[PDB]
Amino acid sequence: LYFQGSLRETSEGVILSVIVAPNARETKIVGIDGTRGRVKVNVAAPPVKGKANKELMKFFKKLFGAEVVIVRGETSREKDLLIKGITKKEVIEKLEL
Numbered sequence: 734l735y736f737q738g739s740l741r742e743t744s745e746g747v748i749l750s751v752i753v754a755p756n757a758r759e760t761k762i763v764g765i766d767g768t769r770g771r772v773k774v775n776v777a778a779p780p781v782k783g784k785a786n787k788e789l790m791k792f793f794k795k796l797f798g799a800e801v802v803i804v805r806g807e808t809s810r811e812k813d814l815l816i817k818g819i820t821k822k823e824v825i826e827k828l829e830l
């Protein structure tokens with residue numbers, strides 16, 4: 734199981750496909766869902782008032798040093814994040830740290 738199954742590079746940056754679980758002890762990557770092609774991300778925020786979406790974006794903006802926006806799944810557990818202006822190679826390097 735590699736992170737490459739959860740990423741693709743468009744003209745704008747990298748779309749990182751995640752599957753979240755809120756109410757977690759710590760925001761962190763906890764796995765890879767090999768069937769869905771998504772990174773399993775625990776989010777230390779409640780799923781109310783957009784707080785889990787905010788925490789998710791904050792985590793990845795800090796990790797990648799780039800603006801992160803939700804492009805699909807704002808009200809789903811399965812969310813696609815656009816990491817603007819970054820390459821897939823850079824995203825893989827940072828996910829593997």
Ligand code: NA
Nearest residue numbers: 783784785786
């Ligand atoms: Na939310």
